[PDB]
Amino acid sequence: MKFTVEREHLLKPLQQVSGPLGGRPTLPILGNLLLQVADGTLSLTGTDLEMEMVARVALVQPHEPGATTVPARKFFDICRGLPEGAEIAVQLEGERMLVRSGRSRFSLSTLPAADFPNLDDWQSEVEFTLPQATMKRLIEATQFSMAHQDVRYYLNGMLFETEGEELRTVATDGHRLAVCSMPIGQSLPSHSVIVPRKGVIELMRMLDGGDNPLRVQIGSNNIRAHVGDFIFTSKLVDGRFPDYRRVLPKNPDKHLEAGCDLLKQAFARAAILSNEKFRGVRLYVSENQLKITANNPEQEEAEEILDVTYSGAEMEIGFNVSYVLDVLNALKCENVRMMLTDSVSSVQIEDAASQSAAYVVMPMRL
Amino acid sequence: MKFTVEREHLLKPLQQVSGPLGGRLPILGNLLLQVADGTLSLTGTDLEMEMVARVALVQPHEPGATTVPARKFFDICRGLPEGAEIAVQLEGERMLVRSGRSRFSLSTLPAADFPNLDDWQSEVEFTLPQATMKRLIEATQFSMAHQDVRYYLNGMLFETEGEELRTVATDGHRLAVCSMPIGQSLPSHSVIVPRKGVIELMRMLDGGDNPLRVQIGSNNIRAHVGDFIFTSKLVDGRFPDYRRVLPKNPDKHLEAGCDLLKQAFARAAILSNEKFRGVRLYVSENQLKITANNPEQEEAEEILDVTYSGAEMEIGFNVSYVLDVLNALKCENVRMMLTDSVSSVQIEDAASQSAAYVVMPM
């Protein structure tokens, strides 16, 4: 095995294929990357047995076929640590891989490519293509609401839902919910899967904001994403996801609109004197005005008054201010819409200018 | 107690005094506020050191003192919009804070409960530019010990000699010294400033033209810059003599680009022992070679061009120490000054003798 390649053509691929690798593997070879020279192409693969990322690099300098595995962290650090515009010559010499460039030489330990574990083979039964940016928006809009290591394992992940011509993402930790729907211009079957949170992050981070389209394949227990030179594959979470349609407030008739930043800064100051554990704040809403109050066990008190667009009936309601701020921070828009009903119902939050993303927070009594 | 001040004027003072404060005596988690003689005084302390900020009151105000949670009060002010005006007043056991239509009511502890550092006398005084103090601390800070049982090493020596103010920091494995002339005839004297004080001292240098005034007593140091007064206790014990650590006659002079050299050591370090982190250097005429290897039999090798005349030698180092030096230097070229394979090495900016770094071999 032999190749010579520019440092810069190796770094992005190394970032991508390093993502999956867990910090304390059950096998020695799981700390390594698989390297293959074949048909004019170097492929790198990293895995953790749950998910896998393969990157491809075209080889325009002379090369010799073969495969081996090297420690991922070290080989990445060497390449990244080498100077800008460097040529990186790699060759397999016995049970060592030789890396050199200019007058820097490294000898890396190998494990055999034959021991590198592959993911279970599977069949695609739902496929579609879409702009990278559409996938990026779907995930960014909802990712923060995924559970982290809940015992309800199916919440530690994101629901991907196909219906008609749109793709929808949903996330919830059992307390707050985020949903986002985008049309993708392909007739799709009605289908639903749960991607594990680590898989969702790899996917998100494999999208480089560029013009390459993203192709998605979904099987019974697996999902795969292909964009340009990168192919990501992950297991699905085998569980049942809650129905998001049930939590959405029915016919909220009291819509409040305000500048996202102004509402955010007001909640952010009020939060300073909220309960540190339960983070409850009170909204008093009246004609074109909102008053926000907070207090903590030490009886310190905050109050914020802003001008808003609001014409409905006067009402009160409490919320977890961290959840509201998470929503306002994910939105990053000019104007926000808060769709209110009463003191005992939940609230749905959106960009004033767009219904594509919706967020649901529970009422707090105080 | 009442005052009304613009956010811009309150923010940096708050930031400075509040920065290092924790609960502990919960009142150590509070700032002392005093309105007196047209001035708002904001004071913070952990009993070892103290930061006092004065700010002029150009609007109507009323005298009096209280104590509020430092973090919450800073966060509130910081969270207010740019150009905002902040009206503060005492009412009951609470401190009211009003800006626009944002209102806040904070808890208080009595100003009488707020502790003072003991009185002391100045024995040594001088002034210097901020930029000089910044440079003196920056050059050496990373070589202080952190939590060594030799308490005298967890901190920085400040020495006056002739016209020079000098800083020294060592942890027993490596050492940094930096001397700067400050245009004054100084008495021969030294004190040890605790690392926490070093950091606050550093952080009080805004980067403006206000000079610094320093006062040293037998158990205290103080620095005035602009409207801030930092006061800290000193550390007991006999600090080592940097001249004993410096090599006596490092005849062998090596010269290389600092970034190039730093890059090589860093790459080589990848394949060094994870615990020891040793690298070998082989010096020969106009050439430096760096090698590293680990238990797994993995090997790194780097070869650079340098300006070296003198005998060939081999010497081992912990790479992180060499990297800390090379990153502290921030220069074009570095001089490596050597004696032999079992003796300390000295490292300087090739273009300045103003700072020197010493590292032991492995």
Ligand SMILES: O=C(O)CNC(=O)Cn1c2c(c3cc(Br)ccc31)CC[C@@H](C(=O)O)C2
């Ligand atoms: O601190 C160590 O790990 C042991 N170092 C020495 O035995 C020699 N030594 C010391 C110091 C030192 C500093 C350097 Br660069 C090299 C060897 C050194 C500074 C602190 C000194 C003290 O104990 O007061 C000792």
Ligand SMILES: [Ca+2]
């Ligand atoms: Ca340069």
Ligand SMILES: [Cl-]
């Ligand atoms: Cl010096």
